[PDB]
Design a protein around this ligand. Structure first.
Ligand SMILES: Nc1ncnc2c1ncn2[C@@H]1O[C@H](COP(=O)(O)OP(=O)(O)OP(O)(O)=S)[C@@H](O)[C@H]1O
Ligand SMILES: O=C(O)C[C@@](O)(CF)CCOP(=O)(O)OP(=O)(O)O
Length: 330
């Protein structure tokens, strides 16, 4: 609000990978081993304001109304260095961010977080970045954030370097408007292996990683053709298989691990029962036990009702798919 003070605020929505990003070719720049395909969710998002002021001497992150720890403080300061290099300036920022994402329920916040921050910085400093360069900037903070620049279906092109690795939105003739995702919240323990660490151990040591690589391009192609034709069953079958293959890779790591628990398998079983009961739907899982169930909007209520026979109402949470991308807000 004062002169010499530059601020910007953005809202960016989370996204869920249907064809998985799993393993980095370049750990420092976050370049992936394979392309990925995601859908951006309407219900869950991060709002982030950044304020650059010549009088600030270091960057500060206030998250959900509270100061972050020294660890997170260091992480955010290193990311802002990237931003300062891009902008050609030396200004430090006060960052105030709120996650509107059920993180206690295990949903991931890094995709919306880094997409929001990149967009906020772009607005604050008038960088005039293209969506491509916003995607590249967000990517540097978290790989999945590259995709949250966009709404609906989005694809992260792996590229081969910092300049070529980024996402773009896929037009699906408005198909995203007909689809929903139900989150089945499942309890794990022993603290989670972050996606970054897990995928690193797997990419580095898994005896089944080559199997993943040999099939991921075929899956992505199949999925994209399914999107062109708005063929729900065809999309579902391939993404469900792809998700399972990603978890298979962890089983081959040295030593093996899994994100899935018996309750996860219970939820998958319910999805298959829904399919056999003329209620088409398909599941996927990320770096934890939650099961995400892709379903057509017309069937959302019904599928949820099947889950509600078994799971607490608090643990069944649905979202539609949003069509628009990252937003600049007040
Ligand atoms: N609004 C935010 N602004 C800045 N950083 C955030 C924000 N929200 C979450 N983070 C950071 O996101 C990191 C978490 O990412 P992860 O450990 O990979 O798990 P996650 O929260 O599910 O995000 P993913 O899995 O990577 S999409 C935390 O270290 C936070 O510091
Ligand atoms: O989102 C997907 O494609 C699949 C996953 O969510 C499944 F676990 C991986 C997310 O990776 P990410 O959180 O980006 O780790 P980072 O790049 O080290 O920050």
């Amino acid at each position: 609000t004062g002169s010499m003070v530059k601020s910007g605020k953005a809202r960016a929505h989370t996204n869920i990978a249907l064809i998985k990003y799993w393993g980095k070719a370049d750990e420092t720049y976050i370049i992936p081993m394979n392309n990925s395909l995601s859908v951006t969710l309407d219900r869950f998002y991060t709002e982030t304001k950044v304020t650059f002021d010549p009088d600030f001497t270091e960057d500060c992150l206030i998250l959900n109304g509270n100061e972050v720890n020294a660890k997170e403080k260091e992480k955010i300061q290193n990311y802002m260095n990237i931003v300062r290099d891009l902008a050609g300036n030396r200004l430090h920022a006060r960052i105030e961010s709120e996650n509107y994402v059920p993180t206690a329920a295990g949903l991931a916040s890094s995709a919306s977080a880094y997409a929001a921050l990149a967009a906020a910085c772009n607005e604050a400093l008038s960088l005039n970045l293209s969506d491509t360069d916003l995607s590249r900037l967000a990517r540097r903070g978290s790989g999945s954030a590259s995709r949250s620049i966009f709404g609906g279906f989005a694809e992260w092109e792996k590229g081969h370097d910092d300049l070529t690795s980024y996402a773009h939105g896929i037009n699906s003739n408005g198909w995203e408007k007909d689809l929903s995702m139900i989150f089945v919240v499942i309890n794990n323990q022993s603290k989670k292996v972050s996606a970054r660490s897990g995928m690193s151990l797997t990419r580095d040591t898994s005896r089944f990683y080559q199997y993943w690589l040999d099939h991921v391009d075929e899956d992505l192609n199949e999925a994209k053709e399914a999107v062109k034709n708005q063929d729900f069953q065809r999309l579902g079958e391939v993404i469900e298989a792809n998700g399972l293959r990603m978890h298979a890779t962890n089983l081959g790591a040295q030593p093996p691990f899994t994100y899935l628990v018996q309750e996860s398998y219970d939820a998958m079983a319910i999805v298959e029962q829904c399919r056999k009961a003329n209620l088409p739907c398909y599941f996927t899982m990320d770096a934890g036990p939650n099961v995400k169930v892709l379903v057509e909007k017309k069937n959302k209520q019904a599928v949820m009702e099947q889950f509600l026979k078994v799971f607490d109402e608090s643990k069944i949470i649905a979202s539609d798919i949003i069509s628009s991308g990252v937003e600049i807000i007040k």
